[PDB]
RNA sequence: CGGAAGGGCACCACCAGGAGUGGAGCCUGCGGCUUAAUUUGACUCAACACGGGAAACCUCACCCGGCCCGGACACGGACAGGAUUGACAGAUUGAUAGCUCUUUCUCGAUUCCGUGGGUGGUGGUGCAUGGCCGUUCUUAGUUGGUGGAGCGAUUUGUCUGGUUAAUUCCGAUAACGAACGAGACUCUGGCAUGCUAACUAGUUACGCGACCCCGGUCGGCGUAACUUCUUAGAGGGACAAGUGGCGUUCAGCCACCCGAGAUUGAGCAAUAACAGGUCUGUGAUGCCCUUAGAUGUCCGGGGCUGCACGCGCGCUACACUGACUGGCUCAGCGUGUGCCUACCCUACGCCGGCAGGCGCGGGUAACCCGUUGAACCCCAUUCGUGAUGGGGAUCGGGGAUUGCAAUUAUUCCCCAUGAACGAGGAAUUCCCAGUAAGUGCGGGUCAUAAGCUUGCGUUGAUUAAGUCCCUGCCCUUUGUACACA
């Protein structure tokens, strides 16, 4: 009965919009919904020199990779999710369905 | 998955994989047009999109090089059989798009226009 | 023989045993979270993968 | 490259069933990544693909580490007389 | 450049005109002699002879070595 | 360009200061010297803890040797009465390299012998180049279309004056209409007792449990609403808006009330150029060199660490505002089991003083390490101005981990030895608010590994709200016999 969605995305809006999407077909299918509970973000920070060769006043890069992470647990059977997980996705979020 | 990659480095696995896509599509369609690449990666479908202007010369003698594609990504990346599929579509407004015309221009300098 | 001397030597460790997965050299190689790659082909690259310089 | 008569039929068997192979550009590799059942090494791989690219039957194409055969028409008629093949069986790439 | 010490000379092979004809000896009548002895390993089972040294036997692609 | 003038600006400039460096020891880099080799690029800002370069093997490009072809393809021979691969032995070698000699077996048209030709090269050339970075240049500058002036190169627009961090605006006007840059933008920091959220964060109430004399503590357990603390989404909030003055009453400037802010910090960053750096990042590359006795590739050892000398970036200190020994007590960035890839963070229980070792577990991460029990600091003894219990360089003996291999001690631990250094000359670096400085913790290099670098957290100030005096930069005028200026 209780089965957990993970999404995981690297652009916001577009994980708001799914999250969302995914809230908007669980108050449409009538279940027990629990809000999208937000993860800590993710900020994958790499360091290096500007300059190909070594020669040069001492600039440093910071690539940034923020990554974040939202779940929602629902009340219901498996061909429920199946369905509402079918329908309405784009390639921003990835999608974890855990059935426990 | 049995192997249990983590996030941090399946997102970066996932950037690398779309770093070496959009680079080999380069070295290889460049005569034809190349114009970019879109992968949606869904479960246990991958649909991978090249993004180009000349598709009949993409496509080539019935689908061929197409499938030659598939194969090469198959082979490459260890997916499985019918796991993942091509399409090729055409760029509107091919003008905008600044690598179709930084290919074209090297190719007239290749060519030999002045 | 030769087949017990051509490539019989270690290479279990150390920065000669990785290298890069575009140059396939030895030196500056990204090893943080499997790039595995130089730092010049990672700047080359970055917005190809993701990364954005924000800030 | 004196190379072995089974694994040098097998490269090429493997060359036929699937037109397009690939190979990854390390000489220090017991195995071939793909065909896995034989020895056939990469190096051999490599030199055997390397002439068939030198007598124009192969296409090349690499992407940071990794080669790519495209194999031309003429490849498969050469193939096919090397082989003994008939002409009515095809590869999978121009299979639809 | 020009060097002190000559060079190492390559392995010049040995070639050997019909090496088989001393392998057997023929006879009159219906039957056939075996000079050298034949190696019990698996890889060559019956049909491969040994190399017959001043010394002792060994046998090559199998490494089998008999001492005396 | 001016040691010519008129304005403005910058802690890579000064003033007032703060911490320093240069004085001693050590670490790292460069030059020099030595050497088989001590590989090489870079020499003011814009070279020197720089190539992410913390090299025992590799990296490695240097030296001494030893293997291998990974010389494709085409044309000629040669050969199936065998073209030719591999080989334990005894010698040689470094090696159990059949590398060569003595010696015969084996593989089966893949190959070998020559001529053309490619391939490979951390080889040369960045004064041939691409790309990237730095610098001119952190300042506010730059450019078209049309119209006007001049024969013309050129000029106006792009400015007399005020203002601004700004060629930012107001306003004049042979200019009008414009464009890049600045600004605008994105992220970060703070304020929202309000909206959305939550068993991978909790809150407060209860029910128990433990302890002390109704009450107090519990990160001991479980559940009842909620989000204040937790995290992240949409919003909002600050704009010189309100007031008092200065100012053409325009552009704007100062102070004050309300208030979390009345200049938070970074990224991006214009035209033109350097003959700045990189061929040692590239299967980016032109040309030249080599190509089998190799500048290709593999293996063993050495070197990149060598030490009469000088410089640079840093660490340790010169102590009593301190050291040692116990007790108390608080963080945030983060990271963590890999395609090849052989190497993760570690809780807890025993053995050992320690470095460490042995077994069960947890964790692909708000789940586990972890409430991250970090240092500085606080409290209480010991010390007593003595090169001292400051300082730990040098050196002897031993014990562990990593790795095939530590010797030129890889690192770590124990005992012992106990040098200079008593606040550092000329010279010079960086900086003004959560800033400098003290202080510790993560990532990168990492098998073993931080005196470096990149981020984060704790304690946390002196002095300044200005100036062109020096060093420089940006406008206008002036002069030039300079234009590689
Ligand atoms: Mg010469
Ligand atoms: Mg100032
Ligand atoms: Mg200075
Ligand atoms: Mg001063
Ligand atoms: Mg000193
Ligand atoms: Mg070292
Ligand atoms: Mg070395
Ligand atoms: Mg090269
Ligand atoms: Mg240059
Ligand atoms: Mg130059
Ligand atoms: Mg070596
Ligand atoms: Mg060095
Ligand atoms: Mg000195
Ligand atoms: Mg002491
Ligand atoms: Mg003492
Ligand atoms: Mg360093
Ligand atoms: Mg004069």
Not at chain 5, 18 to 47: F, H, M, T
Request: proline share 4%; hydrophobic share 35%; aromatic share 8%.
């Amino acid at each position: 009965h209780r089965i957990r969605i993970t999404l995981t995305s690297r652009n916001v809006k577009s994980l708001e919009k799914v999250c969302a999407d995914l809230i908007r077909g669980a108050k449409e299918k009538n279940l027990k919904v629990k809000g999208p509970v937000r993860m800590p973000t993710k900020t994958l920070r790499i360091t290096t020199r500007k300059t190909p060769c070594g020669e040069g006043s001492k600039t440093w890069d910071r690539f940034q990779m923020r990554i974040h992470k939202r779940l929602i647990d629902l009340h219901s059977p498996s061909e429920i999710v199946k369905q509402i997980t079918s329908i309405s996705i784009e390639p921003g979020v990835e999608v974890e369905v855990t059935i426990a | 998955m049995a192997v249990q990659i983590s996030k941090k480095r399946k997102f970066v696995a996932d950037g690398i994989f779309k770093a070496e896509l959009n680079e080999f599509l380069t070295r290889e369609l460049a005569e034809d047009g190349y114009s970019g690449v879109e992968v949606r990666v869904t479960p246990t479908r991958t649909e991978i999109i090249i993004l180009a202007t000349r598709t009949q010369n993409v496509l080539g003698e019935k689908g061929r090089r197409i499938r030659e594609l598939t194969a090469v990504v198959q082979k490459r990346f260890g997916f499985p059989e019918g796991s993942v599929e091509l399409y090729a579509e055409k760029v509107a407004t091919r003008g905008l798009c600044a690598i179709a015309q930084a290919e074209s221009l090297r190719y007239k300098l290749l060519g030999g226009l002045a | 023989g030769h087949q017990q001397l051509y490539w019989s030597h270690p290479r279990k460790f150390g920065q000669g045993s990785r290298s890069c997965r575009v140059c396939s050299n030895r030196h500056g190689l990204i090893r943080k979270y499997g790039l595995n790659m130089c730092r010049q082909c990672f700047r080359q690259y970055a917005k190809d993968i993701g990364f954005i310089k924000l800030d | 490259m004196l190379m072995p008569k089974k694994n040098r039929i097998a490269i090429y068997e493997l060359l036929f069933k699937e037109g397009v192979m690939v190979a990854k550009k390390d000489v220090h590799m017991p195995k071939h990544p793909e065909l896995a059942d034989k020895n056939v090494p990469n190096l051999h791989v490599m030199k055997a693909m390397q002439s068939l690219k030198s007598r124009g039957y192969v296409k090349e194409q690499f992407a940071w580490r990794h080669f790519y055969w495209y194999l031309t028409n003429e490849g498969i008629q050469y193939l096919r007389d090397y082989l003994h093949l008939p002409p009515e069986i095809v590869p999978a790439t121009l299979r639809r | 450049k020009s060097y002190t010490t000559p060079k190492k000379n390559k392995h010049k092979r040995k070639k050997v005109k019909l090496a088989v004809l001393k392998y057997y000896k023929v006879d009159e009548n219906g039957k056939i002699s075996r000079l050298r002895r034949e190696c019990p390993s698996d890889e060559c089972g019956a049909g491969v002879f040994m190399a017959s040294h001043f010394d002792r036997h060994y046998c090559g692609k199998c490494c089998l070595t008999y001492c005396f």
